[PDB]
Design an enzyme around this catalytic site. Sequence first.
Site, PDB file in Angstrom:
ATOM      1  N   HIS A  39       0.830  -1.211   0.000  1.00 39.86           N
ATOM      2  CA  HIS A  39       0.000   0.000   0.000  1.00 39.86           C
ATOM      3  C   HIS A  39       0.860   1.255   0.000  1.00 39.86           C
ATOM      4  O   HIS A  39       1.961   1.273   0.562  1.00 39.86           O
ATOM      5  CB  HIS A  39      -0.987   0.066   1.214  1.00 39.86           C
ATOM      6  CG  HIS A  39      -0.331   0.396   2.525  1.00 39.86           C
ATOM      7  ND1 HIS A  39      -0.106   1.694   2.924  1.00 39.86           N
ATOM      8  CD2 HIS A  39       0.100  -0.392   3.548  1.00 39.86           C
ATOM      9  CE1 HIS A  39       0.454   1.697   4.126  1.00 39.86           C
ATOM     10  NE2 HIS A  39       0.586   0.445   4.529  1.00 39.86           N
ATOM     11  N   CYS A  40       0.328   2.310  -0.638  1.00 40.86           N
ATOM     12  CA  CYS A  40       0.797   3.681  -0.393  1.00 40.86           C
ATOM     13  C   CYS A  40      -0.381   4.430   0.186  1.00 40.86           C
ATOM     14  O   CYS A  40      -1.101   3.853   1.008  1.00 40.86           O
ATOM     15  CB  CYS A  40       1.366   4.330  -1.654  1.00 40.86           C
ATOM     16  SG  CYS A  40       0.437   3.909  -3.178  1.00 40.86           S
ATOM     17  N   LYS A  41      -0.610   5.709  -0.155  1.00 40.20           N
ATOM     18  CA  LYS A  41      -1.812   6.345   0.375  1.00 40.20           C
ATOM     19  C   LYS A  41      -3.046   5.735  -0.282  1.00 40.20           C
ATOM     20  O   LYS A  41      -3.951   5.234   0.404  1.00 40.20           O
ATOM     21  CB  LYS A  41      -1.759   7.863   0.169  1.00 40.20           C
ATOM     22  CG  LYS A  41      -2.984   8.627   0.725  1.00 40.20           C
ATOM     23  CD  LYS A  41      -3.184   8.408   2.223  1.00 40.20           C
ATOM     24  CE  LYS A  41      -4.476   9.092   2.734  1.00 40.20           C
ATOM     25  NZ  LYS A  41      -4.523  10.562   2.418  1.00 40.20           N
ATOM     26  N   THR A  85       2.603   2.315  -5.416  1.00 40.78           N
ATOM     27  CA  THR A  85       2.457   0.852  -5.397  1.00 40.78           C
ATOM     28  C   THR A  85       2.651   0.241  -6.805  1.00 40.78           C
ATOM     29  O   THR A  85       3.310  -0.806  -6.974  1.00 40.78           O
ATOM     30  CB  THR A  85       1.073   0.484  -4.807  1.00 40.78           C
ATOM     31  OG1 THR A  85       0.970   0.901  -3.432  1.00 40.78           O
ATOM     32  CG2 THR A  85       0.774  -1.054  -4.925  1.00 40.78           C
TER      33      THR A  85
END
Lengths: 15, 10, 361, 359
Positions: free
Chosen positions: D268-270, D276
């Site tokens: 995950h990223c934000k 990602t």
Amino acid sequence: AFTDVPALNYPATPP
Amino acid sequence: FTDVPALNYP
Amino acid sequence: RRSVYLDNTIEFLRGRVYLGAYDYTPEDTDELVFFTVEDAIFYNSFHLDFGPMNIGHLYRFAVIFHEILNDPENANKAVVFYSSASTRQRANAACMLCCYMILVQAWTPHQVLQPLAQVDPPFMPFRDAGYSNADFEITIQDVVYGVWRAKEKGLIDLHSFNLESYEKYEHVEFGDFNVLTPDFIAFASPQEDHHLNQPFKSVLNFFANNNVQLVVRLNSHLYNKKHFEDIGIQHLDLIFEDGTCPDLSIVKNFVGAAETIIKRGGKIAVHCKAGLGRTGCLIGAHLIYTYGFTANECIGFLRFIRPGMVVGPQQHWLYLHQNDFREWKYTTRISLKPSEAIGGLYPLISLEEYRLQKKKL
Amino acid sequence: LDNTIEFLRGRVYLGAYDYTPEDTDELVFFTVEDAIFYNSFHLDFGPMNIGHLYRFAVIFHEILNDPENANKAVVFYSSASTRQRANAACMLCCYMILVQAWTPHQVLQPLAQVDPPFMPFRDAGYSNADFEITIQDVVYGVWRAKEKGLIDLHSFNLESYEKYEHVEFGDFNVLTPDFIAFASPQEDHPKHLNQPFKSVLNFFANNNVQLVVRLNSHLYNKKHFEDIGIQHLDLIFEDGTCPDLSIVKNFVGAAETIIKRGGKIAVHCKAGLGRTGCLIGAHLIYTYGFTANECIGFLRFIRPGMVVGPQQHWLYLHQNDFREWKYTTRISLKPSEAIGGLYPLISLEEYRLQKKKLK
Ligand SMILES: [Zn+2]
């Protein structure tokens, strides 16, 4: 949908 | 070219 | 310098360079000067191919563009380059202006592609030169990236480009060839009744003067090879059928032969019947092995120098085998032993065969 | 008819009309443009995803199997928008590749040189577009994925696919047998848990996730994953930027370490889209040989919006590097604290030295 499907394959072309 | 105009990306 | 707002007009440099597409003839004003080259610079179609415009077209466009930019009456004006409204003529004009920015003004691909992205209606993608229904396309993005990568690797140099020589030798009566890179010439097969005709004499003269050391023939015999051997040039057949793709065994023999000559500083001249399809398969495989082009970039760069190269199913073949060619730098080596199949040059062989050669010696 | 493209003579055509055509004794028309909707992030408009394709297939099969249409050709259509035509055309090509075993050159011949052309697909970020992928890119990427065993329509569950895409259930997609892409969990005190967090924890516990990789700043306490035996790793870089190749080599080595244990990696990223896609995209090219454009097309067919902005040109310019690493690197025999005891990719020469005792 993806199960029990009509036949729409690409027609056979010769070698 | 001898007189290439100055059109470089800013 | 103010921005210009005008229908069907794309900004490249604020207040100074625009790309238009019109079904009327625009009028110059105190703030605007317009020009089109469609009557003077045009693409010659083999079948239903329509572009991209080639390096000689681009050079002539650059001369005209500079003359208009440098004219004292235009000193305070924005220059609008335009085409007609057809999606094919729009693609040619846009791609040529991008190639100009890459080769003359040092722009990078993402800088020249931003003004063109998501334009409505879209540009027509480019198709091949063959007779079958099209089934493979390359885009302005592919062509721009291929031309940019070729310039970065030292393969295009507009400062030394000779327009008169380029335009002369493309003609059938002077041999139908182009110098593609410092290592390669692509040409149509010579013809004779074995007394040489003008185009064969033209080819033999140019090859003698420009350090060609190997000629590779890919099509059925239309001439006697002795004419090349009599002026000291090695001659090699690697023949395969018109409209087919070559077996990888042929491609490995070709790449090793080319590597052996390049190591000596010489050029390789390759022909099939037209110097387009079969020749594009083998030279394209070597360019991807050497410089890491994508298949679509390689097709775009080859057609920028020599329109019509890589025909029909050869496009999908180059696309599917690009990882093979590029990664032969790691999975093959040039043989330590000469091969009779390429006239005593050294072929590409597998790492394992190379290991067993060393073990024997 | 007039502006129609033939896919199979006398039975399947693709049309574009700004009116509803009337069915005749030889023709039956249908559209899904008013029932199957692409949910745009910003100015992205497609392509349609694998759940949209499944819903289209159910509708198409019902029309083909209806006895009233036994002696008719079927005309699938959209309005005249160049964006809506691109979506309809790309969905019909994905149907033929995945459900009817056609090859790329067979589905691309009807679409070549159509006037007016189809709008190319753009990214989901907030800058002007500067990179496009085509129907040819998407078709070759979805075909290659199927050939490599990464798409299995026989097991596809639409109900599960659509459920877990929702923010309140965790906003994730299983991309391949090895990888999940998701949005960051959040909790009120990162330094009980909400519904999307409990949903993620339950799915990961039951579907053999063994490593979570976090690419954005801390919005949750990693203990919630480590409590249930899932390793957690930070490889954080700035939102909207491209990762250094050292971060990519760390990621690929950690992913290979987990895959050799039989586990899945969840990234995950934000939003689970841009950052990602850089890292999962690089591993897919390293493993399976996708072009950069094919990789972006396949990723967006499963999870719309992946690979944002300058990350597209970055993947394009480094695809040769990712493929070279299969020959020029190995997994480290010595741990790196930078990836919590997992092993990064290292050079052949460094690997040879690690098998000896440094005297
Ligand atoms: Zn003779």
